[PDB]
């Protein structure tokens, strides 16, 4: 769910996840995808595409189990859809962390999301 996702992003990036990513760029946070603004935005683009392969569970509301082992997100023993969900979430938290070097605060609150250029198919 959003809870696990946020917790993962905090754990990987060290950053308040709604603050940094809730409305970032054309792909991070609320809304759908769009032409990505930068690498961070692409992480989110990839994450939303990842969600589309999911059937059987709801990425926003379904909670799942994971742990923190040797500073690594470890997706739990769940079920098939929840496992892949957890893996989508882990992957975006890692990607966001890896692209902290180019995170741009000026994209943090993109209230112009509805006007982002249409995303290409996943």
Applying CB under 6 A, the residues found at the interface with ligand MYR are 2-3, 5-6, 9, 17-18, 21-23, 28-31, 44, 47-48, 92, 111, 113-114
Does 118 bind its own copies (CB under 8 A)? Our answer is no
Say how many CA atoms lie within 13 Å of 67 toward its Cβ.
5
Q: Look up 47 and say whether it is catalytic.
A: yes
Query: For its own copies, which residue of 56, 68, 79, 109 counts as binding (CB under 8 A)?
Result: 109
CB 23 within 8 A of CB 29: yes
Does 18 bind its own copies (CB under 8 A)? Our answer is yes
What span, in angstroms and rounded, lies between the C-alpha atoms of 95 and 43? 6
What is the 8-class DSSP label of residue 23? B
**What is each CA distance from 25 to 2, 18, 45, 67, in whole angstroms?**
19, 13, 10, 29
State in angstroms the smallest separation of the CB of 45 from ligand MYR.
8
Binding mask 30-59 for its own copies (x = CB under 8 A): xx----------------------------
State in angstroms the smallest separation of the CB of 28 from ligand MYR.
4
What span, in angstroms and rounded, lies between the C-alpha atoms of 8 and 10? 5
User: Other C-beta atoms within 10 Å of 86: how many?
Assistant: 22
| Residues labelled as active-site residues | 47, 89
- Interface ranges with its own copies (CB under 8 A): 1-3, 6-7, 10, 16, 18-19, 22-23, 29-31, 63, 109, 111, 113-114
């Amino acid at each position: 769910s959003l809870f696990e996702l946020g917790k993962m992003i905090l754990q990987e990036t060290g950053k308040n996840p709604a603050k940094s990513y809730g409305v970032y760029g054309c792909n991070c946070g609320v809304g759908g995808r769009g032409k990505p603004k930068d690498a961070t935005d692409r992480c989110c683009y990839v994450h939303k595409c990842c969600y589309k392969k999911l059937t059987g569970c709801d990425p926003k509301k379904d909670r799942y189990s994971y742990s923190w082992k040797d500073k690594t997100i470890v997706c739990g023993e769940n079920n098939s859809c929840l496992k892949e969900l957890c893996e989508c979430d882990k992957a975006v938290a890692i990607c966001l962390r890896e692209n902290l070097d180019t995170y741009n605060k000026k994209y943090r609150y993109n209230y112009l999301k509805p006007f982002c250029k249409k995303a290409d198919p996943c």
